[PDB]
Ligand SMILES: OC[C@H]1O[C@@H](O)[C@H](O)[C@@H](O)[C@@H]1O
Ligand SMILES: OC[C@H]1O[C@@H](O)[C@H](O)[C@@H](O)[C@@H]1O
C-alpha cells in the first residue's frame with residue numbers, strides 16, 4: 045500500500061528541471077577548447093564569471109563532443125539569438141533550433157519498478173589524491189542530488205541515507221573507457237548500464253523526486269569534469 | 282535564550298536572493314510601454330515568452346518610473362551587454378554599469394529588533410471582488426514568501442500562520458497615492474512606512490529567512506501590477 049506524506053518537506057511536489065540544448069558545428073581539437081569557447085561567449089553573465097573565478101561548476105556542460113562539433117546544455121535562461129550570433133563571430137555555426145528540455149510531460153509513476161541509467165561517456169568520481177573510476181550507489185546519489193540543487197536552489201537538505209533505504213542498484217556489467225580532455229590529459233572512467241530498482245516500500249513521492257534528480261544529472265553530467273562532457277547519462281523508464 | 286533547530290527544513294540556511302538592476306534613460310508615456318519594451322528585448326528567452334503567454338509573473342519588474350526613464354530589475358542571469366545593445370536599438374540609453382544585488386554582506390542578526398519597510402510606490406492587493414489598497418500583515422507575508430519562491434524555486438512550503446506567530450506589524454500612519462498604469466487606468470494604493478518587529482520568541486533562523494523574503498519582495502514588488510512598478514519597497518535594518 046501507499047501512505048502519503050503530510051509534512052512540508054515531502055508532501056509537496058518539487059520543480060522539474062528545465063534546460064536548453066544548442067548544437068554547434070565546428071572543429072576544435074579538445075573538449076578544453078569547446079569549454080573555453082562557451083566561457084568566452086558568456087563573459088557578460090556575472091554568475092558565469094564568478095563561478096569560473098571560484099573554480100565552481102559552471103551552469104552549462106559540453107555534450108556529444110567530436111571532431112565535427114559539440115552540444116551545449118545549460119539551465120540558464122539564455123537569449124538563444126545572442127548565443128548563435130556570438131558563436132558565429134567565433135567561426136561556429138549552430139545547427140537546427142534550440143531544444144528545450146524536458147520535451148514531454150511524465151505520466152503517473154504508480155507501478156514504475158525502476159529506472160535504467162546509461163553512462164554514455166566515461167565517468168569517474170574525484171577524491172583528494174585520486175579519482176575513483178567506479179560506480180558507488182551512495183556517491184552517485186550524492187552527485188545527482190547536488191546537480192538538482194544547482195538547478196533548483198532552495199531545496200531543503202535531503203538525507204542521502206534515507207533515499208538509499210528505498211533503492212537498490214544492479215548492473216549486469218560495466219566497462220572502461222578513455223576520455224581525452226586536453227593534449228596532455230586523458231582519463232579512464234567507467235561506462236555502461238546501471239538499473240535503479242525501487243523497493244516495494246518506496247514512498248510514491250520519492251519516485252518522482254528521484255526521476256527529477258536524474259533529469260538534473262542528465263543536464264549537468266555526473267562526476268569529475270562533467271562540464272567537459274564526462275559522465276553523460278541517458279535515463280530510460 | 283536561543284534554541285537552535287535540528288530539523289532539515291529550518292536547521293539549514295536558505296539562499297540569499299540575487300538580482301541585477303539596470304537604469305534606463307528615455308521617455309515613454311506609461312509603465313505599460315516600459316513593460317512592453319522589456320518583453321520585446323527578451324523575445325528569444327523561452328522562459329519569459331512562456332510566462333507571458335500564460336499570464337504568469339515575469340522574472341523582471343519595472344522600477345523607478347518617471348518622465349525621463351525607468352529601471353529594470355531581474356533575477357534572471359542576463360548577458361548585460363545584449364540587454365544594453367537591444368535597449369539602445371529602441372532608443373534607450375543605459376546609465377552607468379549594471380548594479381548587482383545584494384551589494385553588501387549581512388552581519389549576524391542576533392541583536393536585530395525589527396525591520397523598517399517603506400512602500401515607495403502605491404501598493405494594493407488584488408481579489409475577484411476588487412483590489413484592496415490596504416496593508417494586511419498576513420497578506421503581505423504571503424506576498425513576500427511567494428516572491429522568494431519565484432526567485433528561489435525549491436523553497437519548501439512554509440506555513441504563513443507559523444511565521445506570523447513571531448512578528449508584529451505597526452505603522453504611525455499610512456498615506457494614499459495614485460499610480461497611472463495606462464492612458465485609461467489609474468489605481469489608488471497605499472504608501473508609507475511599516476515596522477516589522479520580531480517577538481522575543483522568534484527562532485534565530487527565522488530572522489534571516491524573513492530578511493531574505495523582504496529582499497525578494499524588494500526585487501519583485503508587492504501586490505498587484507508589481508511588474509509595472511506598483512508596490513516597490515525599500516528595506517532598512
Ligand atoms: O534495462 C531495463 C531492464 O534492466 C534489467 O536489469 C531489469 O531487471 C529490468 O527490470 C529492466 O527493465
Ligand atoms: O576528447 C574526447 C574524446 O576522447 C577519446 O579518447 C574518445 O575516444 C572520444 O570518444 C572522445 O570524444
Ligand SMILES: OC[C@H]1O[C@@H](O)[C@H](O)[C@@H](O)[C@@H]1O
Nearest residue numbers: 394395397451452453476478
Ligand atoms: O525601537 C524603535 C521601534 O519601536 C517600535 O515599538 C515602534 O513601533 C517602531 O516605530 C520603532 O522604530
Ligand SMILES: OC[C@H]1O[C@@H](O)[C@H](O)[C@@H](O)[C@@H]1O
Nearest residue numbers: 311312346347459460461462
Ligand atoms: O505612470 C506612473 C505615474 O503615475 C502618477 O499618477 C504618479 O503621480 C507618478 O508617481 C507615477 O510615476
